[PDB]
Write a protein that binds this ligand. Sequence first.
Ligand SMILES: [K+]
Ligand SMILES: [K+]
Ligand SMILES: [K+]
Ligand SMILES: [K+]
Ligand SMILES: [K+]
Ligand SMILES: [K+]
Ligand SMILES: [K+]
Ligand SMILES: [K+]
Ligand SMILES: [K+]
Ligand SMILES: [K+]
Ligand SMILES: [K+]
Ligand SMILES: [Mg+2]
Ligand SMILES: [Mg+2]
Ligand SMILES: [Mg+2]
Ligand SMILES: [Mg+2]
Ligand SMILES: [Mg+2]
Ligand SMILES: [Mg+2]
Ligand SMILES: [Mg+2]
Ligand SMILES: [Mg+2]
Ligand SMILES: [Mg+2]
Ligand SMILES: [Mg+2]
Ligand SMILES: [Mg+2]
Ligand SMILES: [Mg+2]
Ligand SMILES: [Mg+2]
Ligand SMILES: [Mg+2]
Ligand SMILES: [Mg+2]
Ligand SMILES: [Mg+2]
Ligand SMILES: [Mg+2]
Ligand SMILES: [Mg+2]
Ligand SMILES: [Mg+2]
Ligand SMILES: [Mg+2]
Ligand SMILES: [Mg+2]
Ligand SMILES: [Mg+2]
Ligand SMILES: [Mg+2]
Ligand SMILES: [Mg+2]
Ligand SMILES: [Mg+2]
Ligand SMILES: [Mg+2]
Ligand SMILES: [Mg+2]
Ligand SMILES: [Mg+2]
Ligand SMILES: [Mg+2]
Ligand SMILES: [Mg+2]
Ligand SMILES: [Mg+2]
Ligand SMILES: [Mg+2]
Ligand SMILES: [Mg+2]
Ligand SMILES: [Mg+2]
Ligand SMILES: [Mg+2]
Ligand SMILES: [Mg+2]
Ligand SMILES: [Mg+2]
Lengths: 168, 96
Amino acid sequence: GSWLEPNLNRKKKMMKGRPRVPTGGSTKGTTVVWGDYGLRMRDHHRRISAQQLKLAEDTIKQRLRGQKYRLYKRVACNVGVYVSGNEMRMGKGKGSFDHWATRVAVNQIIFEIRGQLHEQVIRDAFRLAGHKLPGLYEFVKKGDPPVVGITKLEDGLTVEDLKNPRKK
Amino acid sequence: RGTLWHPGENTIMGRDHTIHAAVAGYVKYYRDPQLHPDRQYIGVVFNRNDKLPYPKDAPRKRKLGLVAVPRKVEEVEKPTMSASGLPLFVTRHETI
RNA sequence: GGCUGAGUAGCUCAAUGGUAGAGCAUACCGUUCAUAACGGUAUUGUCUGUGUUCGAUCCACAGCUCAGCCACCA
RNA sequence: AAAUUAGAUGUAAAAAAAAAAUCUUAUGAGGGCGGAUCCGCUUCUAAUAUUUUUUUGUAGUUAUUAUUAUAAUAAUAAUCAUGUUUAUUACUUAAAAAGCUUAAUGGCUUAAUCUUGCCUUACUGUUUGAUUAACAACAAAUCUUACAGUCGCGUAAGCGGGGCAUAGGAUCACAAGAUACAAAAAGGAAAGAUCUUGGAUUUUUGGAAAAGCUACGCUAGGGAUAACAGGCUAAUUUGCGCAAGAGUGUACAAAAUGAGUGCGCGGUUUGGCACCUCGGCUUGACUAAUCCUCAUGGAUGCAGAAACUAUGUAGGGUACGACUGUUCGUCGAUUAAAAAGUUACAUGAGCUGGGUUAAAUACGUCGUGAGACAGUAUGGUU
RNA sequence: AACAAAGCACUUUGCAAAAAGACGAUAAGUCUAAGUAUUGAGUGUGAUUUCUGCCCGAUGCCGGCUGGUUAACGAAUUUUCUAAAUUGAAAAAAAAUUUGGUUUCAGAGGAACCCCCGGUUAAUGGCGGCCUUAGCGUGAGGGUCCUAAGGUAGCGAAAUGCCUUGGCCGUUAAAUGCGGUCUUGCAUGAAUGAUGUAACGAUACAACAGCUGUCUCUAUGAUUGACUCAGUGAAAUUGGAAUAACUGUGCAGAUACAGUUUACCUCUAGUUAGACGAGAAGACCCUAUGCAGCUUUACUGUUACUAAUUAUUGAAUACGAUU
RNA sequence: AGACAACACUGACUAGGAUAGCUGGUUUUCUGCGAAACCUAUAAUAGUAGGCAAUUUAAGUAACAUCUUAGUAGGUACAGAACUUAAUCUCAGACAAGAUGUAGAUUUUCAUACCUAGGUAUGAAAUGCAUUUUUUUUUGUAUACAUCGGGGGAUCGUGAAGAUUUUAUCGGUGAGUAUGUAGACUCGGAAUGACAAAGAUGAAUCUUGAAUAAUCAGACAUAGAAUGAUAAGGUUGUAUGUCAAAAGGGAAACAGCCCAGAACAAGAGUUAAGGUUCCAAAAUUAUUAUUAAGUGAAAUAAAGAAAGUUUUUAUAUAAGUCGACAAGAAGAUGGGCUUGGAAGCAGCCAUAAUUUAAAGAUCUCGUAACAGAGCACUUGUUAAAUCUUAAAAGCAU
Ligand SMILES: [K+]
Ligand SMILES: [K+]
Ligand SMILES: [K+]
Ligand SMILES: [K+]
Ligand SMILES: [K+]
Ligand SMILES: [K+]
Ligand SMILES: [K+]
Ligand SMILES: [K+]
Ligand SMILES: [K+]
Ligand SMILES: [K+]
Ligand SMILES: [K+]
Ligand SMILES: [Mg+2]
Ligand SMILES: [Mg+2]
Ligand SMILES: [Mg+2]
Ligand SMILES: [Mg+2]
Ligand SMILES: [Mg+2]
Ligand SMILES: [Mg+2]
Ligand SMILES: [Mg+2]
Ligand SMILES: [Mg+2]
Ligand SMILES: [Mg+2]
Ligand SMILES: [Mg+2]
Ligand SMILES: [Mg+2]
Ligand SMILES: [Mg+2]
Ligand SMILES: [Mg+2]
Ligand SMILES: [Mg+2]
Ligand SMILES: [Mg+2]
Ligand SMILES: [Mg+2]
Ligand SMILES: [Mg+2]
Ligand SMILES: [Mg+2]
Ligand SMILES: [Mg+2]
Ligand SMILES: [Mg+2]
Ligand SMILES: [Mg+2]
Ligand SMILES: [Mg+2]
Ligand SMILES: [Mg+2]
Ligand SMILES: [Mg+2]
Ligand SMILES: [Mg+2]
Ligand SMILES: [Mg+2]
Ligand SMILES: [Mg+2]
Ligand SMILES: [Mg+2]
Ligand SMILES: [Mg+2]
Ligand SMILES: [Mg+2]
Ligand SMILES: [Mg+2]
Ligand SMILES: [Mg+2]
Ligand SMILES: [Mg+2]
Ligand SMILES: [Mg+2]
Ligand SMILES: [Mg+2]
Ligand SMILES: [Mg+2]
Ligand SMILES: [Mg+2]
């Protein structure tokens, strides 16, 4: 399949579910692993659609067309959103399939890029995509520390210091 | 449904894999790697302080479970005539 | 549980103890100066099984399936 | 591409001996001491386990090599083998899958699977303890024990009251057997009683033999459920704004224009919920997201004029007529312009009743029919 | 526009004791009728002109077999219990047979309805398709499937047309209307009659001329009420009230709560914005193992009516059928 | 015409004889205790029965509740990528030896042709750097023998043959202690809650006997879910509480929120939540900072913009920061191509140089094309002794 069209059956309906809310000190997906730069969702956890991610990719390609680069996608659309008729009355079972989506936690990388482009050009492309994606996004470089919740582990800060009851 | 736990010391398993108690003791959940390395058993011990699985070399711990009562010494007293003066049984024999 | 009818070639229909047929729907040929008509031929074979008789589409039994009314219907 | 067969882990198999310690056990020494086998403390011996532990020993046999005088000693290699090598035996061989009457989950591989032998306990009666007192009651249920009776398999121990587990409804009546209880004067019997057994889309499955219309309708209730309005919400909208800028604009992103989008306001349209059960005329009030009139910025795309866009601003105005029941909408002709919205989609104890609109009637369609229809038509106590 | 109606058509009625039809807890009997097939009754249509086509399969009715089925009746069968007798058994014994009483099983033959055959549309009712064509369209034409038969004549955006304000024409300065016309008529159609005129209509729709205070746009005048004095003297209604405005709140629309604002006390004539104003359980929807009337191939029943037969009630002959 | 048959007619009036699981009503005081709106069944779902269970007061208690200590059952949050699911990324080869050549130095060892045991030559090795190597005409070790076809090229090549080869191409396979994903993934794994034992505490709260009810649309709040649209004062479970049936203080007003459970009085009494300038009981009480917008002050409007302001952390400065002003800003050279024309400045390709105090084969205007005016960059003058620039955060617009 693909990252926008999974190899799943549309007939089997899926519950709404909720994005992952790490409350134990997890840093999964909060670091650039493949490319040199990334696009991080820094405000809140959402459920992005396959149509909103496809538009974000076209925006980056439209801005970086005619140049050498390598775009990695760190999210996959594997959540079937079944929308019942907004004109229908409550009940009578679940709704029909509408589109594919993906749940993303806070401070997680959406895209990554690696190329000989200037830092400014990549920033503009990511900014244009952040305006067309739901939420607020941030430019991230490779090597910066991970993020535990909404707190960056900067200045030698560790995960054990965030768990220590004594902080003052 | 199925043998998640297996019958152990002083326990029996039912047709539907239900584990019962075979004696009057105390329930114990344990694992016996000597008998089977991938099974967990349920047993019943007579002493609350006992610990299973018992060592394979120690003598079996078992209770009598019987009460002593005077034996019946009733000897042959079968009569032949009823209270109505009738024979309690008549014996016939065929001859050829 | 009880009783009765029943189907034959692709399609539609005959044949009752004795050959297993007719018509049609393609095809080939013949006829005609030529065409259309017409004529001839060809296959596609008795619902299935068993039994009775020298001999069975045919009579007897069982079943498939269709149909008649039944039996139960606490 | 898809037929059958053969394969697809590794180790071990002469034999050990001995010292202490860490626990754990013992119906071992009938240990000792407090209260033989009861109990919490207790030494000793023994057993299991654990240390990588302190080690000692690791031969014999066959062969090779070296020294020594065919044997002796040392080192190295091989060594399960008195046995039909197709060896055998023990241990090990992830998970899933296959199999186990049937879906799915769990479980079984040391048997609940497979193969084979003999069998038919897929037995009769009574009965124990449970399902933290089955199903949050009762009942029909589920698992389980014991005793008596007498059968099967097995060397034996022992196992068997159907199936690896979880998916098949009573009474009454009826029918087939048994029991010997009662027998409406008496002797019998009939009809009853007890035990066993069978036939159920009794499927509204704790178990009625059961089709519709009413707009001619009635009563008791409910607003515990609807339509109008109000309320909450805002998917939607024929309501708007901002942000970013692919693109159009001969050139040049932002004069104008603005794909698919993102962040919002607002409560006008069609909707959701269920807290609660029309238009016109007359006469206003209010909002400003502005049709005209006033001031004004930008406008390679502001020469002028006119218009475009935008910023202030709601004082006043926004008319007449034809069609339609119409708000809406179409059109004619004027005008500086003939813009919108809220107020119970303002206003019916102020009017109107054309629309919708009970009884009458016809038409088309649907219905076997009575009748019905978001249908159409004439009429219909405000 | 509905009913009736003259006219039209169909079914029925032979009168010999009752013509049919209607009435009669149910009869005698009455109306029909002191009538007789040109009479009476029932059904539909609705003067007249021009017309009324196709289908008897389904449903209903009518006719018909010495047929099939066939309740009662009934040839042939069969059983429970008990009394007595016989046989058997004669051991602790039933059991079997015949007769009496008692009580069951049982069906060759044997009615109508029904099955089967035929008839009937101004009886209830029904009156389809799919391919191909002289070149694209259009089908005189041809082939094929199905049905009882496939909507004929005529009419046709209709009182019937959802799409729709159908296309065109005329009418208006402007036509969702009206009239004419063409057709593919969602869903026209021939006595549930089709169609075209004369005459008729407080029917419904549209147009023209005239006329007007209907209107642009109202004004004046008259009488009776309204108003004041005198006389007489109601009613609906009313939990109690010292009964303002705004925003908010809240069983979700406040004179009465919160906050702020404003207002001296009390009447009269006007007015109807609110008091979710009053009145009417008026109106809608839902509920009740509540009702009523009506319908039918709902369930369960009763009748008209049809068929057989004991009895009242006795016979003769012929023929046919089972054999 | 369901028309009329004397208020009434889809069947009058009158007398006699009903029911209503429905609505409404049910009358004095004091005192004690005190629910439920859940489960199961029902021709039921507005009803009812049986349970749970409110009450009465007698028997019991090794009762019940709570904590402590020890033990047990079970897999949620979390976390992780093991098994399973979706998608994505990287790798598919490493070493030792051997062999194969090349320029050497002409020293040593070794083998042969010789000469006469030494030299004479001849070669080979030793030696340094290349070089071949996982199925190869290259074996071994260690490893998953660690990869196979299709398609696009370059070679050899035959009477057409496709043997041999290449890919920063496709698919598959193998490997990864690589990245993510979770209602039907859980190897790891809480707290909480549940069961039972002993002990202690406590307000009898518990069980049983006898007697005997009500209730069976619940609402909201908080947390976490399903559903809806990650809307509803929406619908539907779970945990906890309140209201219902609870007054009182606080939240302006307030069924459900924060406190606290009203037998009646007295008190500048002691406190909770909450508050203390005035309405209005109590501070115009102290300390350190921020804001200038009445922002705000008891119901947070968003993204976003910006010489608002403060603070922090870097950084510039008499080697003159910052700003302005004066001049310069070259040359090979109109780079090559393209084009009617392309001269830095339509487009395409290249953009190692050179000489300078510096000067992009050219950043923004301009020309038909040149020219021309600016920029980057460079020197100089003016001039700051806490005074430059940027980023982040706080409060504001
Ligand atoms: K965004
Ligand atoms: K009507
Ligand atoms: K509700
Ligand atoms: K008529
Ligand atoms: K016919
Ligand atoms: K007929
Ligand atoms: K006929
Ligand atoms: K008969
Ligand atoms: K016609
Ligand atoms: K009023
Ligand atoms: K304020
Ligand atoms: Mg129970
Ligand atoms: Mg007697
Ligand atoms: Mg039931
Ligand atoms: Mg049940
Ligand atoms: Mg309600
Ligand atoms: Mg200007
Ligand atoms: Mg003025
Ligand atoms: Mg209104
Ligand atoms: Mg009003
Ligand atoms: Mg009239
Ligand atoms: Mg006529
Ligand atoms: Mg008569
Ligand atoms: Mg007529
Ligand atoms: Mg008889
Ligand atoms: Mg006969
Ligand atoms: Mg006719
Ligand atoms: Mg007719
Ligand atoms: Mg007076
Ligand atoms: Mg209000
Ligand atoms: Mg008051
Ligand atoms: Mg008035
Ligand atoms: Mg009031
Ligand atoms: Mg009527
Ligand atoms: Mg009437
Ligand atoms: Mg109390
Ligand atoms: Mg409760
Ligand atoms: Mg029932
Ligand atoms: Mg009720
Ligand atoms: Mg686990
Ligand atoms: Mg609610
Ligand atoms: Mg209540
Ligand atoms: Mg309170
Ligand atoms: Mg206050
Ligand atoms: Mg005080
Ligand atoms: Mg004070
Ligand atoms: Mg140029
Ligand atoms: Mg150039």
